[PDB]
Design a protein around this ligand. Structure first.
Ligand SMILES: O=CN1C[C@H]2C[C@H]3O[C@@]2(Cc2[nH]cnc23)C1
Ligand SMILES: O=CN1C[C@H]2C[C@H]3O[C@@]2(Cc2[nH]cnc23)C1
Length: 130
């Protein structure tokens, strides 16, 4: 229905606004673009599904997310990719892990404060009907 398409348009507006607030935070610069093959040719052999905040905005615009849950699976994949690729005790690895955990926790905290639980349940019920 037209009302259902208006629901999904509101979901996309919400997700673009959360993603922009993450992307401008200086702590999260390392997560704003895909990893360059030139800097890590090793990256794509270890990490089987790369993800970054630029790719997330492209996916919002392609209508890939019909619920906040499916958006948070990609935020969680940005974080888990960084924890798995950079697991060592040295300071460079510990700094990117701390920033990855902060990206995840910040996204969840904005959603907790600003998403209406009844809006998310409506998106889930439209998705399940298709
Ligand atoms: O050597 C400098 N770089 C290679 C990468 C290693 C580490 O920082 C990256 C980008 C990225 N993403 C996850 N972990 C890293 C840029
Ligand atoms: O279910 C979760 N809630 C937390 C709030 C955030 C968001 O939805 C609210 C109420 C409200 N008013 C404006 N924006 C919202 C209820």
């Amino acid at each position: 229905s037209m009302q259902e398409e208006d629901t999904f348009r509101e979901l996309r507006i919400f997700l673009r606004n959360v993603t922009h607030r993450l992307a401008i935070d200086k702590r999260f610069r390392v997560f704003t673009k895909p990893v360059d093959p030139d800097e890590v040719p090793d990256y794509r052999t270890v990490i089987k599904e790369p993800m970054d905040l630029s790719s997330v905005i492209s996916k919002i615009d392609l209508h890939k997310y019909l619920t906040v849950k499916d958006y948070l699976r990609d935020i969680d994949l940005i974080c888990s990719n960084a924890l798995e690729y950079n697991p060592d005790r040295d300071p460079g690895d510990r700094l990117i892990r701390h920033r990855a955990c902060a990206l995840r926790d910040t996204a969840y905290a904005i959603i907790k404060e600003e998403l209406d639980e009844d809006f998310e349940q409506l998106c889930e019920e439209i998705q399940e009907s298709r």
